[PDB]
Amino acid sequence: WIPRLLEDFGDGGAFPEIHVAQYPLDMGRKKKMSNALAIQVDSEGKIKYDAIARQGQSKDKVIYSKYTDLVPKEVMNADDPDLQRPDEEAIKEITEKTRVALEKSVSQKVAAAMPVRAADKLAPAQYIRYTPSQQGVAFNSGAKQRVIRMVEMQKDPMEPPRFKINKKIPRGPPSPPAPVMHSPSRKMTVKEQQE
Amino acid sequence: VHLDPAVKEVQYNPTYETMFAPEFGPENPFRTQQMAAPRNMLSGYAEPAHINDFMFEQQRRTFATYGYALDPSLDNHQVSAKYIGSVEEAEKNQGLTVFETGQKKTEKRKKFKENDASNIDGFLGPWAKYVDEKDVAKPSEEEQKELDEITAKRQKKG
Amino acid sequence: AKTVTKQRVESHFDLELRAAVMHDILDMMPEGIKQNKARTILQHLSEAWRCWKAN
Amino acid sequence: RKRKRGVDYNAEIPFEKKPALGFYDTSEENYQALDADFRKLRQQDLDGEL
Amino acid sequence: SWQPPNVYLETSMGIIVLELYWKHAPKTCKNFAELARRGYYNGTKFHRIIKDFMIQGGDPTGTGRGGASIYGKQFEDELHPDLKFTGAGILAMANAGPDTNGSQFFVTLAPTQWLDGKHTIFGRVCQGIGMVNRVGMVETNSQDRPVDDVKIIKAYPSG
Amino acid sequence: SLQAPIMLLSGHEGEVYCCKFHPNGSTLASAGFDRLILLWNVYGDCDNYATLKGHSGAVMELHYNTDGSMLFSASTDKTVAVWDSETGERVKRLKGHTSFVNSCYPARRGPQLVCTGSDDGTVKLWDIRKKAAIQTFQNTYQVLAVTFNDTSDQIISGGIDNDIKVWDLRQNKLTYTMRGHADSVTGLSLSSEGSYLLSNAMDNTVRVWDVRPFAPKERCVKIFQGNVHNFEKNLLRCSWSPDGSKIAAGSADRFVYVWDTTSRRILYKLPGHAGSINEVAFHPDEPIIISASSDKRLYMGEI
Amino acid sequence: NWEDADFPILCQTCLGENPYIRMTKEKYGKECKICARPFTVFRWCPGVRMRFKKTEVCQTCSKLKNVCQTCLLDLEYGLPIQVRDAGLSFKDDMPKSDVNKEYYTQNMEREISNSDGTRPVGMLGKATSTSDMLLKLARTTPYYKRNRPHICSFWVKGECKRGEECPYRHEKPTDPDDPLADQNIKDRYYGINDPVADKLLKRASTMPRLDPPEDKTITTLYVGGLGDTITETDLRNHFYQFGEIRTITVVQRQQCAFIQFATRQAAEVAAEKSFNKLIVNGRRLNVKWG
Ligand SMILES: [Zn+2]
Ligand SMILES: [Zn+2]
Ligand SMILES: [Zn+2]
């Protein structure tokens, strides 16, 4: 029963009965704006130095940055249900998903080829229910939500293109560099360097 | 008490106990009014409604004519109904809409009529102007001079 | 994406020949080479073609 | 001045990429600007000897 | 109706020993010791982990809304005027509102005002604040859920 | 659970005002604002085969016979078309109302009878063999929902006077009035036993009323909550489960409520419906729920 | 690129006082006033005597800077961009010169399309740390006076031949001898020399704030406006956050409470956190030094 330090705490744990402002590890009240990304550790493994490799990638992106990714696996003896093409019905399912996904972009590309043969028609005038998320006593008037009727504007057939498109800017940065995973630099000799 | 909080689109038919139990624990303090509200894209939650056209435009024109309307919220404070607007005129005029025969009928405006189409340069069927309100609106006696002053101050710039 | 029609044919052939030679010398040099010296081998190839035409 | 590009060089950093940040706080530290000294400095001095 | 000392956790990251307060809240401690004894946490995970706030743990469904008790799904609170949420390591009972507690604990990481405003202090950690701080450094998402499994392997109502 | 997890029944161009399960339960037929009634086989792959046209209004009420061989539905143009389940042909049309027919019911067991109610304030009893009204009951306010007791002696009518009325076929008199709603009644339905009648209203409350030779005399047997009505003023209909254990009623908040018959506890409250829900129906053998709504889609929830 | 999005990003005093709104969607109607790449134009009428406002900038130029697409004011607080960047940091540094602007726009739009499409992309982590003075001059009620038709330029020359049918206002235009009348679009967007922002930050400078100890080390707190409906055993609980609390002198005859803490730092803090902000027991608790 004397906190007063980080020493008297043997292996941490602030006693909530002292009624002081003690704190076991350095959970400072005025932690400044630090731009370091958090040094995060996996379930029981090492410090994730993979986090400095995935700057602009997502969380499900699979990249290889460890030495365990360089060692060969075993012979994987025979007709094992591990190394199998997944399922013929799953193949048909992925085939159907992919053909439906590609035919839509095909139709959107092909719509340019004949612009107006049977010139366009539009009336799916619809409703959307919108919750403004910045609630005020007087702001909507008096309600949590508001309903908006959207009509697509009717396009003039006798109307040329509106804006310049030929403008061009240089190619942006590519995705974050992948680590190389190379072998250890086979040694070069002076004699072969001269030959 | 059985299901994930939000992933979406459950493949099995859920129970009321297994989907609408509240989340346990305290809220995190690291969110604002915009971040704590279940918003959809930067300014709130937008979902496709399917309201009847006539009833929508009825309440819309009722607000635009008077200043009150019913609440199109899904639940809100749970309750069968309430009105949203200038609430005092809703219970005053018993909550009528524009598409219904009105309670008030007084003080109609007066306009010309020459509905015969026989007298040339005298006919005005539905183009009849009001007898009281009149065309070109010259402003005032001092409004003119102060507008001349403000245009002169504009002239001292260019 | 301009088409190789009739007046681009020899220039496109000699454009692609250089590229195939560049890929082959990038694959042919061993691991500890300074990765320079491509232009000189391309000049040796042009001179070898001139010496073929001159017999 | 009658040109599209070109004035974008002194005004700001042209095609700026931010240095990738991680595992070390580097928000506090800063660099010191060059001494002007516009009574000795010459066009040859900035460039260096030929 | 016995009163064990400190409870041995065996999490995925390491071994944390929990010091539970038997005077100020004996009913939560008896319930928690019983749930640790029966094997109710062997395989449950730290479902809600917010950085520098707390680590919520203990759920057979692993959702943040499930759980029960040995009394059945609810029991009262023990809001004592001596225990106050200040400092890291404080072991607690997760809430849903007034006098409604299931089988979810949370170790608090920071001094807080609304916590001892509306929560009951179970106890504290005694051995293993480093592994707790490693659990605090786990990658999260929109709803502050971990990417990997930070689950508890075994548990002992020791002493 | 029988081959049903949830599915999706579509085809409708307008709000689906009503849908009922095949007496067999194998097949189904729905209809709504689209002036079309859809039959989709429930089993196998749930696909419609026979469509029944011949309606110049909103197929407001849709019903089935105990056998289910003959299906009769009520439209908004004041004319009711009777169509057999097999071959789908307008077989017996009865036209006696001066305004919109809001709802219809067919008497089970006893010789064929049909009741209708409309905006003209009247309730009419039809014998399918006569091509003429048998009895007419002038109320004075618009009638929204009507059902027969299992004895085929009484007609139960819900209107906009907040008061469910019971008519005696022999006396032709107002036998009973039920008080307990604060607003218009939109949907009535009898238990399979004859024992209880379920009501939805604009007063925000689902009420069960018990109809018996010996009645407590204040038949507010139970009250349930959750079901919301709003500015759309849609007719809302409710249904009894095959065994009378569950109560389903649609709402304008797109939530399929289903309470426990004995404990009045919300058993289900499923989502997946974009627009207001107009009717919820139970399969006669298996725990399958058909939900119909103004978003023009159907779901086959399985419990 | 194009933009092609559904349902614009709007505040509530631009979207009107009617909960029932009709708007039209035009697919690639105009160009952005900032980006100059064309976007989807949404156009509605706010109310009855209003102006038919439409969206002026892209979804992207409002994602980068957390504003409404037509008034270019904050979604959450409703203040100009220069004020909100003054009450925060300024680490966006969007380029204003041409090619750099379109290059930065392409790359940040790639970063947006390589994400969910819901958050402020760079403003989120600095939008966690908030509740500065900008919360204390945020407008509570909607300012519906913006949604208002322009001055009739035929009436200014005294030649408005429409008269009573003219939907444009017959009232005074603002005097151009005013800093408040220059107002470029891009100056309001990039947070450079916005005179509305100048007047708001000037109003801000005047406003009450927690102050430093008159003499060194003094953690003495002179607390005015206590009231006798409160208890001093709760103060401690609402104060302990800071650290071990030093002296706690109590006087209920003036209703003033003096306090003492270990360090002056904590006392400054308690001022800061506490001054012109704290209320407990539904009663304002006012603080001063000595
Ligand atoms: Zn833009
Ligand atoms: Zn705005
Ligand atoms: Zn005018």
mmCIF file of C-alpha atoms in Angstrom, chain F:
data_model
loop_
_atom_site.group_PDB
_atom_site.id
_atom_site.type_symbol
_atom_site.label_atom_id
_atom_site.label_comp_id
_atom_site.label_asym_id
_atom_site.label_seq_id
_atom_site.Cartn_x
_atom_site.Cartn_y
_atom_site.Cartn_z
ATOM 1 C CA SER F 1 -36.910 -26.458 -42.124
ATOM 2 C CA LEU F 2 -37.936 -27.526 -45.622
ATOM 3 C CA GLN F 3 -35.683 -26.488 -48.555
ATOM 4 C CA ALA F 4 -36.150 -22.883 -47.462
ATOM 5 C CA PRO F 5 -33.408 -20.602 -46.073
ATOM 6 C CA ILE F 6 -34.681 -17.324 -47.532
ATOM 7 C CA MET F 7 -34.749 -17.241 -51.378
ATOM 8 C CA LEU F 8 -36.361 -14.296 -53.223
ATOM 9 C CA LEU F 9 -39.635 -14.065 -55.140
ATOM 10 C CA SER F 10 -39.807 -11.346 -57.803
ATOM 11 C CA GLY F 11 -41.743 -10.469 -60.950
ATOM 12 C CA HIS F 12 -44.148 -7.830 -59.651
ATOM 13 C CA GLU F 13 -44.212 -4.287 -61.067
ATOM 14 C CA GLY F 14 -46.027 -2.716 -58.123
ATOM 15 C CA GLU F 15 -46.695 -3.178 -54.429
ATOM 16 C CA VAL F 16 -47.754 -6.734 -53.505
ATOM 17 C CA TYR F 17 -50.903 -6.103 -51.482
ATOM 18 C CA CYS F 18 -51.665 -9.742 -50.715
ATOM 19 C CA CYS F 19 -50.277 -13.253 -50.895
ATOM 20 C CA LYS F 20 -51.611 -16.491 -49.468
ATOM 21 C CA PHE F 21 -50.280 -20.013 -49.157
ATOM 22 C CA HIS F 22 -51.757 -22.901 -51.110
ATOM 23 C CA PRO F 23 -54.150 -24.883 -48.989
ATOM 24 C CA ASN F 24 -51.795 -27.729 -49.802
ATOM 25 C CA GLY F 25 -48.868 -25.374 -49.129
ATOM 26 C CA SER F 26 -46.935 -26.820 -52.060
ATOM 27 C CA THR F 27 -47.796 -23.848 -54.251
ATOM 28 C CA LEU F 28 -48.525 -20.156 -53.904
ATOM 29 C CA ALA F 29 -50.408 -17.277 -55.510
ATOM 30 C CA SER F 30 -49.848 -13.555 -54.901
ATOM 31 C CA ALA F 31 -51.292 -10.311 -56.247
ATOM 32 C CA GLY F 32 -51.122 -6.571 -55.646
ATOM 33 C CA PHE F 33 -51.057 -3.064 -57.180
ATOM 34 C CA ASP F 34 -49.782 -4.495 -60.471
ATOM 35 C CA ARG F 35 -53.226 -5.910 -61.271
ATOM 36 C CA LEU F 36 -51.527 -9.246 -61.672
ATOM 37 C CA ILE F 37 -51.634 -12.309 -59.432
ATOM 38 C CA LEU F 38 -48.574 -14.498 -59.312
ATOM 39 C CA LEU F 39 -48.315 -18.205 -58.767
ATOM 40 C CA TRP F 40 -44.851 -19.568 -58.104
ATOM 41 C CA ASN F 41 -44.364 -23.169 -57.095
ATOM 42 C CA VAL F 42 -43.045 -23.010 -53.571
ATOM 43 C CA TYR F 43 -41.064 -26.267 -53.754
ATOM 44 C CA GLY F 44 -38.194 -27.177 -56.079
ATOM 45 C CA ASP F 45 -37.049 -23.797 -57.373
ATOM 46 C CA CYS F 46 -39.985 -21.492 -56.558
ATOM 47 C CA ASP F 47 -41.028 -20.451 -60.082
ATOM 48 C CA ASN F 48 -44.395 -19.055 -61.215
ATOM 49 C CA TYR F 49 -46.272 -20.792 -64.041
ATOM 50 C CA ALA F 50 -49.829 -19.474 -64.229
ATOM 51 C CA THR F 51 -50.787 -15.812 -64.201
ATOM 52 C CA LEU F 52 -54.368 -14.658 -63.745
ATOM 53 C CA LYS F 53 -55.244 -11.449 -65.577
ATOM 54 C CA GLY F 54 -58.656 -9.821 -65.752
ATOM 55 C CA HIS F 55 -58.575 -7.030 -63.212
ATOM 56 C CA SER F 56 -59.059 -3.307 -63.778
ATOM 57 C CA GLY F 57 -58.001 -2.441 -60.246
ATOM 58 C CA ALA F 58 -55.680 -3.382 -57.419
ATOM 59 C CA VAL F 59 -56.070 -7.038 -56.494
ATOM 60 C CA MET F 60 -56.442 -5.746 -52.942
ATOM 61 C CA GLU F 61 -57.656 -8.927 -51.179
ATOM 62 C CA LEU F 62 -56.530 -12.424 -52.296
ATOM 63 C CA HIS F 63 -57.945 -15.576 -50.596
ATOM 64 C CA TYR F 64 -58.141 -19.378 -50.839
ATOM 65 C CA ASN F 65 -60.755 -22.038 -50.088
ATOM 66 C CA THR F 66 -60.324 -24.731 -47.440
ATOM 67 C CA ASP F 67 -59.594 -27.066 -50.313
ATOM 68 C CA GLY F 68 -57.939 -24.140 -52.091
ATOM 69 C CA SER F 69 -59.266 -25.354 -55.438
ATOM 70 C CA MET F 70 -61.073 -22.081 -55.970
ATOM 71 C CA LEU F 71 -59.263 -18.835 -55.345
ATOM 72 C CA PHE F 72 -61.127 -15.538 -55.119
ATOM 73 C CA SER F 73 -59.482 -12.087 -54.812
ATOM 74 C CA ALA F 74 -60.908 -8.583 -54.407
ATOM 75 C CA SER F 75 -59.988 -5.670 -56.702
ATOM 76 C CA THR F 76 -60.187 -1.856 -56.403
ATOM 77 C CA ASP F 77 -62.660 -1.386 -59.290
ATOM 78 C CA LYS F 78 -65.667 -2.740 -57.318
ATOM 79 C CA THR F 79 -65.732 -6.159 -59.074
ATOM 80 C CA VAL F 80 -64.506 -9.497 -57.633
ATOM 81 C CA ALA F 81 -63.133 -12.186 -59.991
ATOM 82 C CA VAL F 82 -63.250 -15.878 -59.018
ATOM 83 C CA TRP F 83 -60.483 -18.061 -60.413
ATOM 84 C CA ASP F 84 -59.856 -21.747 -59.912
ATOM 85 C CA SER F 85 -56.309 -22.703 -58.923
ATOM 86 C CA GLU F 86 -56.145 -25.149 -61.827
ATOM 87 C CA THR F 87 -56.327 -23.689 -65.380
ATOM 88 C CA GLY F 88 -56.485 -20.099 -64.118
ATOM 89 C CA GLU F 89 -59.731 -18.903 -65.721
ATOM 90 C CA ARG F 90 -62.023 -16.108 -64.564
ATOM 91 C CA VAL F 91 -64.858 -18.392 -63.551
ATOM 92 C CA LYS F 92 -67.467 -16.447 -61.545
ATOM 93 C CA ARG F 93 -67.354 -12.626 -61.368
ATOM 94 C CA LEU F 94 -69.744 -10.773 -59.023
ATOM 95 C CA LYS F 95 -70.372 -7.056 -59.455
ATOM 96 C CA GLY F 96 -72.389 -5.203 -56.844
ATOM 97 C CA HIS F 97 -70.456 -2.349 -55.259
ATOM 98 C CA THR F 98 -70.616 1.305 -56.303
ATOM 99 C CA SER F 99 -67.030 1.939 -55.157
ATOM 100 C CA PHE F 100 -63.684 0.226 -54.596
ATOM 101 C CA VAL F 101 -63.794 -3.268 -53.145
ATOM 102 C CA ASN F 102 -61.408 -3.144 -50.207
ATOM 103 C CA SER F 103 -61.596 -6.851 -49.126
ATOM 104 C CA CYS F 104 -63.175 -10.310 -49.483
ATOM 105 C CA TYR F 105 -63.429 -13.615 -47.627
ATOM 106 C CA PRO F 106 -64.686 -17.067 -48.606
ATOM 107 C CA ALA F 107 -66.653 -19.212 -46.132
ATOM 108 C CA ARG F 108 -65.016 -22.592 -45.481
ATOM 109 C CA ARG F 109 -67.043 -25.775 -44.765
ATOM 110 C CA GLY F 110 -70.619 -24.521 -45.408
ATOM 111 C CA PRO F 111 -72.192 -24.021 -48.858
ATOM 112 C CA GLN F 112 -70.134 -21.579 -50.920
ATOM 113 C CA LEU F 113 -70.312 -17.980 -49.673
ATOM 114 C CA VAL F 114 -68.282 -14.846 -50.242
ATOM 115 C CA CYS F 115 -68.215 -11.581 -48.369
ATOM 116 C CA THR F 116 -67.079 -8.186 -49.609
ATOM 117 C CA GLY F 117 -66.659 -4.676 -48.230
ATOM 118 C CA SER F 118 -66.072 -1.357 -49.972
ATOM 119 C CA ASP F 119 -65.769 2.395 -49.794
ATOM 120 C CA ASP F 120 -69.545 2.744 -50.327
ATOM 121 C CA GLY F 121 -69.945 1.748 -46.664
ATOM 122 C CA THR F 122 -71.642 -1.574 -47.416
ATOM 123 C CA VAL F 123 -70.924 -5.195 -46.759
ATOM 124 C CA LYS F 124 -72.347 -7.774 -49.156
ATOM 125 C CA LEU F 125 -72.944 -11.512 -49.003
ATOM 126 C CA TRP F 126 -72.588 -13.369 -52.220
ATOM 127 C CA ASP F 127 -73.647 -16.795 -53.264
ATOM 128 C CA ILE F 128 -71.342 -17.766 -56.144
ATOM 129 C CA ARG F 129 -74.327 -19.420 -57.946
ATOM 130 C CA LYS F 130 -76.685 -16.388 -58.032
ATOM 131 C CA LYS F 131 -74.899 -13.529 -59.877
ATOM 132 C CA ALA F 132 -76.536 -11.160 -57.384
ATOM 133 C CA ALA F 133 -76.104 -9.890 -53.830
ATOM 134 C CA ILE F 134 -77.867 -11.912 -51.129
ATOM 135 C CA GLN F 135 -77.650 -9.404 -48.303
ATOM 136 C CA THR F 136 -76.455 -5.831 -48.003
ATOM 137 C CA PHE F 137 -75.401 -4.171 -44.733
ATOM 138 C CA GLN F 138 -75.200 -0.413 -44.933
ATOM 139 C CA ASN F 139 -72.739 0.921 -42.361
ATOM 140 C CA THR F 140 -72.087 4.664 -43.100
ATOM 141 C CA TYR F 141 -68.273 4.747 -43.086
ATOM 142 C CA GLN F 142 -65.866 2.999 -45.460
ATOM 143 C CA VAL F 143 -65.313 -0.692 -44.720
ATOM 144 C CA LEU F 144 -61.729 -2.013 -44.895
ATOM 145 C CA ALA F 145 -61.637 -5.653 -43.744
ATOM 146 C CA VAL F 146 -64.107 -8.533 -43.488
ATOM 147 C CA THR F 147 -64.089 -12.173 -42.330
ATOM 148 C CA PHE F 148 -66.604 -14.998 -41.580
ATOM 149 C CA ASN F 149 -66.704 -17.128 -38.407
ATOM 150 C CA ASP F 150 -66.254 -20.913 -38.934
ATOM 151 C CA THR F 151 -69.961 -21.549 -38.415
ATOM 152 C CA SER F 152 -70.792 -19.272 -41.384
ATOM 153 C CA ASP F 153 -73.306 -17.410 -39.139
ATOM 154 C CA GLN F 154 -71.451 -14.196 -38.489
ATOM 155 C CA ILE F 155 -69.684 -11.516 -40.482
ATOM 156 C CA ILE F 156 -66.925 -9.551 -38.846
ATOM 157 C CA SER F 157 -66.206 -6.108 -40.274
ATOM 158 C CA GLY F 158 -63.477 -3.554 -39.579
ATOM 159 C CA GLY F 159 -63.906 -0.007 -40.830
ATOM 160 C CA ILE F 160 -62.663 3.497 -40.128
ATOM 161 C CA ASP F 161 -64.823 4.062 -37.070
ATOM 162 C CA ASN F 162 -62.280 2.200 -34.903
ATOM 163 C CA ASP F 163 -64.919 -0.359 -34.027
ATOM 164 C CA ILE F 164 -65.120 -3.969 -35.193
ATOM 165 C CA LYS F 165 -68.710 -4.929 -35.991
ATOM 166 C CA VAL F 166 -70.393 -8.322 -35.962
ATOM 167 C CA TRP F 167 -73.411 -9.063 -38.183
ATOM 168 C CA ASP F 168 -76.012 -11.842 -37.700
ATOM 169 C CA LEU F 169 -77.008 -13.531 -40.985
ATOM 170 C CA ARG F 170 -80.491 -14.469 -39.704
ATOM 171 C CA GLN F 171 -81.429 -11.299 -37.810
ATOM 172 C CA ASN F 172 -79.539 -8.942 -40.143
ATOM 173 C CA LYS F 173 -78.706 -6.834 -37.125
ATOM 174 C CA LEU F 174 -75.675 -5.295 -35.516
ATOM 175 C CA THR F 175 -75.051 -8.077 -32.981
ATOM 176 C CA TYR F 176 -71.766 -6.903 -31.465
ATOM 177 C CA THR F 177 -69.475 -3.930 -31.369
ATOM 178 C CA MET F 178 -65.851 -4.103 -30.268
ATOM 179 C CA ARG F 179 -64.177 -1.057 -28.762
ATOM 180 C CA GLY F 180 -60.405 -0.872 -28.207
ATOM 181 C CA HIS F 181 -58.840 0.720 -31.275
ATOM 182 C CA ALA F 182 -58.015 4.420 -31.407
ATOM 183 C CA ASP F 183 -57.912 4.452 -35.215
ATOM 184 C CA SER F 184 -58.955 2.686 -38.439
ATOM 185 C CA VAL F 185 -58.811 -1.091 -38.648
ATOM 186 C CA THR F 186 -56.991 -2.310 -41.705
ATOM 187 C CA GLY F 187 -56.898 -6.098 -41.416
ATOM 188 C CA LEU F 188 -58.836 -8.916 -39.755
ATOM 189 C CA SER F 189 -58.198 -12.633 -39.623
ATOM 190 C CA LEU F 190 -59.780 -15.591 -37.823
ATOM 191 C CA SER F 191 -57.888 -18.405 -36.087
ATOM 192 C CA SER F 192 -58.177 -21.822 -37.794
ATOM 193 C CA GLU F 193 -60.276 -22.890 -34.757
ATOM 194 C CA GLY F 194 -62.793 -20.068 -35.027
ATOM 195 C CA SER F 195 -61.677 -19.070 -31.574
ATOM 196 C CA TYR F 196 -59.833 -15.745 -32.084
ATOM 197 C CA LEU F 197 -59.717 -12.800 -34.491
ATOM 198 C CA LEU F 198 -56.562 -10.810 -35.110
ATOM 199 C CA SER F 199 -56.659 -7.077 -35.954
ATOM 200 C CA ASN F 200 -54.245 -4.384 -37.234
ATOM 201 C CA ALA F 201 -55.011 -0.692 -36.900
ATOM 202 C CA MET F 202 -53.785 2.873 -37.289
ATOM 203 C CA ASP F 203 -53.874 3.172 -33.479
ATOM 204 C CA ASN F 204 -50.435 1.519 -33.269
ATOM 205 C CA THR F 205 -51.642 -1.771 -31.751
ATOM 206 C CA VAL F 206 -52.214 -5.407 -32.813
ATOM 207 C CA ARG F 207 -55.195 -6.742 -30.845
ATOM 208 C CA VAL F 208 -56.566 -10.267 -30.488
ATOM 209 C CA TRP F 209 -60.311 -10.547 -29.906
ATOM 210 C CA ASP F 210 -62.047 -13.758 -28.806
ATOM 211 C CA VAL F 211 -65.425 -14.608 -30.338
ATOM 212 C CA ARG F 212 -67.430 -17.290 -28.499
ATOM 213 C CA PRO F 213 -71.019 -18.156 -27.562
ATOM 214 C CA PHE F 214 -69.994 -17.323 -23.970
ATOM 215 C CA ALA F 215 -67.788 -14.225 -24.045
ATOM 216 C CA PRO F 216 -66.128 -12.296 -21.183
ATOM 217 C CA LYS F 217 -67.991 -9.332 -22.720
ATOM 218 C CA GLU F 218 -64.792 -7.222 -22.801
ATOM 219 C CA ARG F 219 -62.868 -9.217 -25.371
ATOM 220 C CA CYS F 220 -59.524 -7.395 -25.360
ATOM 221 C CA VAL F 221 -57.804 -10.777 -24.936
ATOM 222 C CA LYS F 222 -54.290 -9.564 -25.758
ATOM 223 C CA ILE F 223 -52.363 -6.597 -27.174
ATOM 224 C CA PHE F 224 -49.036 -6.646 -29.061
ATOM 225 C CA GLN F 225 -46.720 -3.850 -30.154
ATOM 226 C CA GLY F 226 -43.999 -2.971 -32.674
ATOM 227 C CA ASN F 227 -46.106 -2.656 -35.824
ATOM 228 C CA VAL F 228 -45.847 0.858 -37.351
ATOM 229 C CA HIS F 229 -48.264 2.652 -39.741
ATOM 230 C CA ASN F 230 -47.372 6.012 -41.352
ATOM 231 C CA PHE F 231 -48.365 8.566 -44.044
ATOM 232 C CA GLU F 232 -48.584 5.869 -46.749
ATOM 233 C CA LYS F 233 -51.912 4.652 -45.231
ATOM 234 C CA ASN F 234 -51.416 1.182 -46.730
ATOM 235 C CA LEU F 235 -53.908 -1.503 -45.819
ATOM 236 C CA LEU F 236 -52.108 -3.787 -43.386
ATOM 237 C CA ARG F 237 -53.025 -7.451 -43.016
ATOM 238 C CA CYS F 238 -52.089 -10.052 -40.449
ATOM 239 C CA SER F 239 -52.141 -13.873 -40.389
ATOM 240 C CA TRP F 240 -52.341 -16.835 -37.986
ATOM 241 C CA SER F 241 -49.874 -19.680 -38.132
ATOM 242 C CA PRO F 242 -51.254 -23.133 -39.140
ATOM 243 C CA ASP F 243 -51.301 -24.186 -35.450
ATOM 244 C CA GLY F 244 -52.300 -20.775 -33.979
ATOM 245 C CA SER F 245 -48.984 -20.424 -32.069
ATOM 246 C CA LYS F 246 -47.612 -17.491 -34.121
ATOM 247 C CA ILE F 247 -48.946 -14.129 -35.206
ATOM 248 C CA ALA F 248 -47.511 -12.279 -38.138
ATOM 249 C CA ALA F 249 -48.339 -8.778 -39.233
ATOM 250 C CA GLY F 250 -46.687 -6.499 -41.750
ATOM 251 C CA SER F 251 -45.610 -2.923 -41.042
ATOM 252 C CA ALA F 252 -44.555 0.257 -42.783
ATOM 253 C CA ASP F 253 -41.105 0.074 -41.200
ATOM 254 C CA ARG F 254 -40.180 -2.948 -43.344
ATOM 255 C CA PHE F 255 -40.106 -5.355 -40.406
ATOM 256 C CA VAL F 256 -41.797 -8.749 -40.373
ATOM 257 C CA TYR F 257 -43.037 -9.077 -36.797
ATOM 258 C CA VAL F 258 -44.081 -12.492 -35.482
ATOM 259 C CA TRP F 259 -45.167 -12.780 -31.838
ATOM 260 C CA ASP F 260 -45.625 -15.888 -29.688
ATOM 261 C CA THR F 261 -49.262 -16.969 -29.627
ATOM 262 C CA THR F 262 -49.280 -17.775 -25.905
ATOM 263 C CA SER F 263 -46.728 -15.391 -24.371
ATOM 264 C CA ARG F 264 -47.137 -12.451 -26.776
ATOM 265 C CA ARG F 265 -43.372 -12.282 -27.342
ATOM 266 C CA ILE F 266 -41.719 -11.157 -30.580
ATOM 267 C CA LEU F 267 -40.391 -14.429 -31.956
ATOM 268 C CA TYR F 268 -39.044 -12.925 -35.172
ATOM 269 C CA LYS F 269 -38.493 -9.468 -36.655
ATOM 270 C CA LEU F 270 -36.750 -10.224 -39.944
ATOM 271 C CA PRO F 271 -35.385 -7.595 -42.393
ATOM 272 C CA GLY F 272 -34.617 -7.809 -46.109
ATOM 273 C CA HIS F 273 -37.553 -5.671 -47.164
ATOM 274 C CA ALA F 274 -36.922 -2.254 -48.692
ATOM 275 C CA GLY F 275 -40.437 -0.896 -48.854
ATOM 276 C CA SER F 276 -43.406 -1.023 -46.529
ATOM 277 C CA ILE F 277 -44.673 -4.557 -46.000
ATOM 278 C CA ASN F 278 -48.229 -5.303 -46.919
ATOM 279 C CA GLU F 279 -48.812 -8.967 -46.013
ATOM 280 C CA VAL F 280 -47.156 -11.868 -44.262
ATOM 281 C CA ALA F 281 -48.285 -15.491 -44.750
ATOM 282 C CA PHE F 282 -47.469 -18.878 -43.217
ATOM 283 C CA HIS F 283 -46.987 -22.166 -45.025
ATOM 284 C CA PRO F 284 -49.681 -24.658 -43.854
ATOM 285 C CA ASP F 285 -47.251 -27.524 -42.957
ATOM 286 C CA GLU F 286 -43.687 -26.208 -42.629
ATOM 287 C CA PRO F 287 -42.253 -23.144 -40.837
ATOM 288 C CA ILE F 288 -42.047 -20.978 -43.992
ATOM 289 C CA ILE F 289 -42.997 -17.312 -44.125
ATOM 290 C CA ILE F 290 -43.900 -15.431 -47.285
ATOM 291 C CA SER F 291 -43.405 -11.712 -46.911
ATOM 292 C CA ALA F 292 -44.943 -9.389 -49.520
ATOM 293 C CA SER F 293 -44.170 -5.692 -49.796
ATOM 294 C CA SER F 294 -44.271 -2.501 -51.752
ATOM 295 C CA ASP F 295 -40.732 -3.107 -52.978
ATOM 296 C CA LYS F 296 -42.158 -5.635 -55.425
ATOM 297 C CA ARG F 297 -40.220 -8.583 -54.061
ATOM 298 C CA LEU F 298 -41.094 -11.644 -51.982
ATOM 299 C CA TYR F 299 -39.017 -13.578 -49.469
ATOM 300 C CA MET F 300 -39.407 -17.170 -48.236
ATOM 301 C CA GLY F 301 -38.111 -17.049 -44.667
ATOM 302 C CA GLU F 302 -37.581 -20.476 -43.077
ATOM 303 C CA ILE F 303 -37.720 -20.963 -39.294
#
